[PDB]
Amino acid sequence: CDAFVGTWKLVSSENFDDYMKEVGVGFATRKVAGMAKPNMIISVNGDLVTIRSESTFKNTEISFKLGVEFDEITADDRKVKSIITLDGGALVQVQKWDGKSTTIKRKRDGDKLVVECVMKGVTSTRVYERA
Amino acid sequence: CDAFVGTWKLVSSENFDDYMKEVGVGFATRKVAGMAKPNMIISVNGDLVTIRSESTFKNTEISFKLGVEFDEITADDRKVKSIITLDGGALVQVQKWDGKSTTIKRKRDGDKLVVECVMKGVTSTRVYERA
Numbered sequence: 001c002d003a004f005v006g007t008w009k010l011v012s013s014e015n016f017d018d019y020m021k022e023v024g025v026g027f028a029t030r031k032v033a034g035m036a037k038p039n040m041i042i043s044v045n046g047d048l049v050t051i052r053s054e055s056t057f058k059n060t061e062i063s064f065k066l067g068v069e070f071d072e073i074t075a076d077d078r079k080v081k082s083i084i085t086l087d088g089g090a091l092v093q094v095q096k097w098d099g100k101s102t103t104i105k106r107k108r109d110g111d112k113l114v115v116e117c118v119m120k121g122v123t124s125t126r127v128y129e130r131a
Numbered sequence: 132c133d134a135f136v137g138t139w140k141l142v143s144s145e146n147f148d149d150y151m152k153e154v155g156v157g158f159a160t161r162k163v164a165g166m167a168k169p170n171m172i173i174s175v176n177g178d179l180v181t182i183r184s185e186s187t188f189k190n191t192e193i194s195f196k197l198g199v200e201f202d203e204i205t206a207d208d209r210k211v212k213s214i215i216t217l218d219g220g221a222l223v224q225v226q227k228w229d230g231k232s233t234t235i236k237r238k239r240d241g242d243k244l245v246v247e248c249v250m251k252g253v254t255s256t257r258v259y260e261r262a
């Protein structure tokens with residue numbers, strides 16, 4: 001888990017407006033969210049992992065234990081059930097709500113944190129680097 | 132093991148001339164070795180790890196499997212028996228020769244590869260970063 005610890009700044013985004021659309025995100029929300037360029041701050045305190053996201057759009061924060069399901073209000077205000085695991089060296093988050101799901105894979109790849117989000121066939125990719 | 136993969140350049144050295152002395156390294160060898168500023172290249176091919184070190188002083192290379200003892204000729208021409216493990220998230224190498232030993236711990240710490248070498252109480256520290 002310590003490989004993910006640090007402050008990370010957005011470096012690139014691809015197909016994100018398409019992903020948010022499949023999730024159900026509204027037009028005006030999709031617009032300011034794409035313009036954000038947020039900083040992802042990941043920390044660990046004992047067995048508790050915290051993933052914070054900061055921008056002018058929104059500031060969210062989840063705190064969780066690996067493999068323990070938790071309630072989460074997403075940045076676009078969906079109420080979901082979330083489970084995060086360590087799986088092939090990546091942090092894999094599955095979010096479930098209203099019979100649907102999406103998967104948010106966070107992995108290391110050289111000096112980059114690579115976040116890929118999938119929702120029944122629509123994939124977006126966001127690369128972060130160390131701020 | 133993929134956290135260690137890449138090219139790494141020397142960034143800092145501390146107490147290295149003292150460590151080499153306790154190991155048994157000669158004067159003239161100690162002098163050019165301290166001036167080197169080498170690049171450490173770590174790669175993996177299946178279950179085989181390769182750690183290469185390149186400089187004007189010397190170019191060495193070890194290839195090994197985790198937890199399997201192997202013969203190694205060091206940069207200063209000691210013939211040793213070496214075992215490398217993954218232990219607390221660090222690559223830990225123990226080198227044995229002539230009833231002696233030294234330990235070479237390689238660990239990640241933010242964006243740095245931190246190599247610490249110990250020989251009965253004399254410790255040196257070398258920090259590398261991604262070239």
Ligand SMILES: CCCCC/C=C\C/C=C\CCCCCCCC(=O)O
Pocket residue numbers: 020023025033036038039040053054057074075076104115116117126
């Ligand atoms: C770090 C938060 C990025 C800003 C998110 C802004 C709006 C998000 C709204 C709906 C989609 C949810 C985001 C899911 C992917 C995590 C963000 C990332 O893949 O990086």
Ligand SMILES: CCCCC/C=C\C/C=C\CCCCCCCC(=O)O
Pocket residue numbers: 151154156164167169170171184185188205206207235246247248257
């Ligand atoms: C990467 C090789 C560095 C150059 C080494 C030059 C001379 C070494 C001679 C005797 C001491 C052996 C080095 C043991 C520590 C590994 C090097 C490092 O801690 O970084």
